[PDB]
Swiss-Prot record, chain A:
One GO term describing the cellular component: cytosol
Subunit details: Component of the large ribosomal subunit (LSU). Mature yeast ribosomes consist of a small (40S) and a large (60S) subunit. The 40S small subunit contains 1 molecule of ribosomal RNA (18S rRNA) and 33 different proteins (encoded by 57 genes). The large 60S subunit contains 3 rRNA molecules (25S, 5.8S and 5S rRNA) and 46 different proteins (encoded by 81 genes).
Role description: Component of the ribosome, a large ribonucleoprotein complex responsible for the synthesis of proteins in the cell. The small ribosomal subunit (SSU) binds messenger RNAs (mRNAs) and translates the encoded message by selecting cognate aminoacyl-transfer RNA (tRNA) molecules. The large subunit (LSU) contains the ribosomal catalytic site termed the peptidyl transferase center (PTC), which catalyzes the formation of peptide bonds, thereby polymerizing the amino acids delivered by tRNAs into a polypeptide chain.
Protein name (record): Large ribosomal subunit protein eL21A
Cross-link Glycyl lysine isopeptide (Lys-Gly) (interchain with G-Cter in ubiquitin): where in chain: K1
Anything else known: There are 2 genes for eL21 in yeast.
Keyword Chaperone: no
Subcellular localization(s) per the UniProt record: Cytoplasm
Keywords: Cytoplasm, Isopeptide bond, Ribonucleoprotein, Ribosomal protein, Ubl conjugation
Residues that span the membrane, as ranges: none
Species classification: Eukaryota, Fungi, Dikarya, Ascomycota, Saccharomycotina
Main localization of the protein described in the UniProt heading: cytoplasm
GO terms of molecular function: structural constituent of ribosome
From Swiss-Prot, chain B:
Top-rank taxon, per record: Eukaryota
Protein name as catalogued: Regulator of ribosome biosynthesis
Protein's job: Required for ribosome biogenesis.
UniProt subcellular location: Nucleus
Residue numbers spanned by region Disordered: 71-88
Complex formation: Component of a hexameric 5S RNP precursor complex, composed of 5S RNA, RRS1, RPF2, RPL5, RPL11A/RPL11B and SYO1; this complex acts as a precursor for ribosome assembly.
Disruption phenotype: Depletion causes defects in processing of pre- rRNA and assembly of ribosomal subunits.
Amino acid sequence: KVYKVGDIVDIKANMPHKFYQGKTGVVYNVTKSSVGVIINKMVGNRYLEKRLNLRVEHIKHSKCRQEFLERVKANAAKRAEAKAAVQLKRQPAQPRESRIVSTEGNVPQTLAPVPY
Amino acid sequence: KPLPKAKAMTKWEKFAAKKGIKPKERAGKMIYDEASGEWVPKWGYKGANKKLDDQWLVEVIDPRTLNRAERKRLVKKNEKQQRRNMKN
């Protein structure tokens, strides 16, 4: 596919000759049949910058930024609707609420962990 | 036809005669490599020479073509040495 400098991509792979799989980065250089992706490494506790070059055959576009754009669009829509609500911030997973369950649906049974 | 007793007076033979470097025994093509679980012979079939180009991570401008250019330049230097020695 078409790739340009600054695009965020992930290091895909199709024994692997190394363990660089899963090191997402951003393409900083492109050429006829190769691309350059910047990756970060560290020694001890000091982070370090590393330049990385990969064959285009094993690079795919990153979909992480899509969620940010979707959230921005949702916030814009909420703001537009507010002109004719508030508290548009994301909410964490709330705990389950109380509910009544009838035994008619399925009477509790014994599963006998003998096991058999 | 005459007897082709004439041989190559290349500089290598003179250096070997001067030095104590014994001639190589030509053990075999089966060199050993790592990260592959196979011999991967040096030269003769898909050797380590093309491994640097085949491998998809050149962590260090396209560096893959630079290695091929260097190998071709070494081959050209060998050809130039052959031409120079041909005048012996």
